[PDB]
Symmetry: D2
Subunit: 334 residues, 4 copies
């Protein structure tokens, strides 16, 4: 009765996508693939430092593990092209390893027998990059490989859309104060990709770092292509992040109240709105893709010239996951 | 002939001031006042979590404690007007309690017999706010109460001065990714000043917060008064901070290379320059008031319209202290 | 009907006790007293760094705040003897301020009009110290002031009981690897109680510290009075803790299997048992007073002489709170 | 004249060994091997999060990098047997990768041309395990592969030796509250060795874990073989650690003062002694292999039966390094 999903890469995004799917009828994870044994997989599903204990029940069985009575098959195959996808009748592969972030590379799941692939990151190649409730409408059903964009792109897109539609975006710059992730080192050490900053002890530093979110926003919102750029500061929280966006607008005597109200009007399941003076732990586990913070809006006016700054929270884990899973469900139903 | 200094408030800034002063001939700390016993004071001078073990030798004696043979008298008097300053012949009080951040209030150290008061923070009232090597030249020696501004003002002033002198500052917005400080709570709890953000567990959160640095920059650099504003995100590192500044300039085809070179030309003892991909812990204990990071410069250009972003590191503790003590020496020598 | 509860001190234990009480029929919080405004109180109930967002709905109203339709009155009176307890018909005051940890002092709630006082810490004076499901049976209903003991006493008591009942306890030593609490400083600073270790940056240090739990265990379990002692290492996690107990027994050829089985047999609502390789974050928010961890049991045998070590987890916040509220319910129903 | 050292694995122990060797005449590092480029290597030697900026000057050159005028050749060869050791005339390889912790495996450096190998961890096979100033005297000069033991063994040995020599060791149990290391994950994720605890976010958890230090102590002190065991709690500090040891002694009316005095009498360059109430950050960068903390001694006495507990600090990085390099110097000079 259900769309058959396989999760490639049972990592933070992979396991949290598994949890979200439990809460979404019509979708079923029938297989999981990673580089480890069932014991570890089952254990990291039950127990989660920031996101809390898994609510149901998990036991290691023969082909894999059993979750709330349902069997999930598991695999330990680093080369996606060799996975038993045709055999298991996979509708969509959720690509969450970080190693298949390209159309041509992801094509391996298709050869292996899956109908479609949704990648949990920005991907190179000829494919659509989708932020749910910003541009998922651009999917027609004939896509075989699709990108879910990044946590940061999902935090930013709905914000940038409102700024542009309601005020006219001229240009802007972005900083995300971002929680540290699995690709930072625990202690100062060689970094696999040669990045001298990601090399550094993650939980002991403010670490400047690059991100394509603002540069590659034009893939989600074409009419503002090339008008945004920026970076990240990785800081010592384990999850939870904040996007600051500083912009020049066409409209002229813009106020705090006008920007805030425009944001509230656009609010939905993916784009939240708050006036509470919250902090990063308050968003851990939240399912908005972006939580716009009216307490942080600022307008600098000197004569007729204005800079407008806004800020939106996101749980780079669960917020991205909730968006990814919504896009999965929409993609599957075409 | 040594300048006699009393330190009011043997806290982070006060103890580090003491340490710096050991390295500057012509200055001598003769007394220290706080709310605690000698044992605690000596102990917190010897041992320092972020700044390391005190290099010299410290032992508790009768009137206070003895540092490398020299006696320091200590007091436990919360009412500054009751301190034996006239008796000890104090030239300058370094006011570091956080409770006398006002000209009229700080006047109490004068009544008590000190010649001058230097306040380790922004201060209200009719006084000069001094960032060394930006506007210390404004001191004429007739001042009795002076502000050394904030760690953030010191990180920003030299950057804003260059931007304005070389390019013409129209407007800008600031964000400091800032280490947590002693006025944040360890755990979520009522906050003394009623700030619902500073109330939250300091080491577990990205905490938005206000700062007057950018707004009160016009006190250090009058020709850009009212052209900057911004705030802070307090994050979980124990010291070390970064100021990001996003600006609109009058000059028109501005490049990364031009902005970077202009900063390098202004470098000195207070304003450092780096091209290394450093992170926050790399600036702990440094003595530049501001370390400009060329790796972080960005120029957004859409048609003829540009935004320019730059960033400068500072150890909110030691950088500010090194500036404070430079201003102290200069103020005393007039 | 409902037992009327007032909470004195709406801090970590106070707010979590409020939360627990929402889930326990027959109990109702009708008043709350602290040193802050309603805005702050409401806000700290909604938002909680380690414990998560309050599930219901909270709004500031006239006399205090409204939680899920029910009105809670709030007060800002530091002197308990002046609280309107007689007026509000208070059955039990939950004493959670940390400032009335003595029978004579807590007597102030009684004069003010409350029938009974339950203190959320160890307390001096002529009173019973109660760990639920170890010695709550010692309450007869004529008590007016009772102590709920400490988070550590609650972690230890059920473990010590089994060891003594099943094996004969000769002597032991204890260490709790304990999350940092609100009475530790954010940065190195004078400590109010003069403790040179609690003075130190909480989230940056392993900090040895005292605790009476093991020494004052004989108040909960008289038959082993004087046979235990030990201390704490406060470490940088915001909540969640682990007690290690090393003991000499009378019984002779003791095994890991015998100790673990004996603990399983004693398990209930208050004393959990696990064989999973969990870590501290997994116990955040848990409601057992003590979670025995079988994976950590060790027996050292040299000839006929044995040391036995065991370890039990506890969320120093929620685990203590669940125990406190169980004891409150039992105390009230007599 | 100078002993020629190659460092295999330019990691935390490898780079700090490099730093220590700068301070020790008669040793020279002439080559370094790792899995990364020179740019990374030089960069991680200049900047160190916990240990501070490298004091000298480092530049990337042709064959590797230049440190204070001296050339160090660098290699990127994961298979030790293929390194140019015979060609560079290597006297001792410092084995610091974590992958050659066995006599037979390490034998690859010897084939490659090195005369001797010192391994920076416990190692399996027929070799001596050496804690400097406890059993380095056991080296005769004919050894080709030697283990420098672990940081924990180095913290424990000199303590255990005094306890046994002066009191008679019957049995004991150990816990090290230990800083997190580079083999812990930044976020909950599959762990390469299948350890479900080491899999967990390092900087957010108290993580129980095994260590052979106490079990394999009999390799360093054979007369107490089989008398000690225990484990670790990994906690969120980035370096700095504490060993707690609980013991039963033959000597009967043992006091705190007797134990502390006995420790003081054994103090030297490897075994320090303190009566100050220090915390973990106070030992970062220290060069004692073990710092005995008299403030933490405890004696539980019930009738004639006593438990004795003691505690010694160590910087698991710099302490182990200082010991390792002392053993390297001694080994080389035979
Ligand atoms: N905040 C975030 O962590 C976040 C947010 C949005 C998107 N993403 C993206 O999601 C992807 C996954 O990220 P993550 O943070 O969960 O990382 P993660 O490291 O936690 O998970 C990666 C997992 O993939 C497994 N894996 C690696 N190579 C594999 C192979 N080739 N075959 C099968 N399994 C393999 C690893 O064992 C690991 O479990 C990345 O592209 C990342 O940018 C991450
Ligand atoms: N990064 C920083 O901490 C930083 C940087 C620049 C400026 N400042 C400013 O310097 C001031 C102090 O900062 P801090 O972080 O050192 O605070 P802190 O709490 O560490 O130090 C304050 C000290 O003053 C003592 N004290 C309080 N009232 C007193 C009184 N009435 N008489 C004598 N002693 C008293 C306290 O016991 C404590 O030792 C504040 O104004 C702060 O804004 C702080
Ligand atoms: N892990 C824990 O936090 C924990 C565990 C077990 C027991 N306890 C005990 O619970 C008590 C409180 O602990 P906490 O950690 O929640 O501390 P906390 O500071 O978080 O809470 C104390 C609250 O009491 C308020 N308060 C202080 N004095 C008051 C007064 N005179 N009248 C009314 N309100 C006052 C404070 O403003 C604060 O809101 C302490 O006795 C503590 O030892 C704490
Ligand atoms: N507290 C401590 O960190 C500490 C204390 C005592 C002993 N040790 C031991 O020292 C060893 C290294 O520990 P670390 O903490 O420095 O870890 P680390 O990961 O920082 O260092 C390991 C280094 O070796 C490199 N490497 C791995 N395989 C290699 C190969 N085959 N060829 C060349 N380079 C290779 C890695 O790139 C890395 O640079 C471990 O065995 C550890 O047990 C560590």
């Amino acid at each position: 009765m259900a769309v058959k999903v396989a999760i490639n890469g049972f990592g933070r995004i992979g396991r949290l996508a598994f949890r979200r799917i439990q809460e979404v009828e019509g979708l079923e994870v029938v297989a999981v693939n990673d580089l480890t044994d069932d014991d570890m997989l089952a254990h990291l599903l039950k127990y989660d430092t920031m996101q809390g204990r898994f609510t149901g029940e998990v036991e290691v069985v023969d082909g894999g593990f059993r979750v709330n009575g349902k069997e999930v098959k598991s695999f330990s195959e680093p080369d996606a092209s060799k996975l038993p996808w045709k055999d298991l009748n996979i509708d969509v592969v959720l690509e969450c390893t970080g190693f298949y972030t390209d159309k041509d590379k992801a094509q391996a799941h298709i050869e292996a027998g899956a109908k479609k692939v949704l990648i949990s990151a920005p991907a190179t190649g000829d494919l659509k990059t989708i932020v749910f409730n910003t541009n998922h409408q651009e999917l027609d059903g004939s896509e075989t490989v699709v990108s879910g964009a990044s946590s940061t792109t999902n935090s930013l897109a709905p914000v940038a859309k409102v700024l542009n539609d309601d005020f006219g975006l001229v240009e802007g710059l972005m900083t995300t104060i971002h929680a540290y992730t699995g690709d930072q080192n625990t202690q100062d050490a060689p970094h696999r990709k040669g990045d001298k900053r990601r090399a550094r002890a993650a939980a002991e530093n403010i670490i400047p770092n690059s991100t394509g979110a603002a540069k590659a926003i034009g893939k989600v919102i074409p009419e503002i292509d090339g008008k945004l750029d920026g970076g990240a500061q990785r800081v010592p929280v384990a999850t939870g992040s904040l996007t600051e966006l500083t912009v020049v607008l066409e409209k002229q005597d813009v106020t705090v109240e006008q920007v805030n109200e425009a944001m509230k009007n656009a609010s939905n399941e993916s784009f939240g709105y708050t006036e509470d003076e919250i902090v990063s732990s308050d968003v851990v586990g939240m399912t908005y893709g972006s939580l716009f913070d009216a307490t942080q809006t600022r307008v600098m006016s000197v004569g007729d010239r204005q800079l407008v700054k806004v800020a939106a929270w996101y749980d780079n884990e669960m917020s991205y996951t909730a968006q990814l899973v919504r896009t999965l469900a929409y993609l599957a139903e075409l």
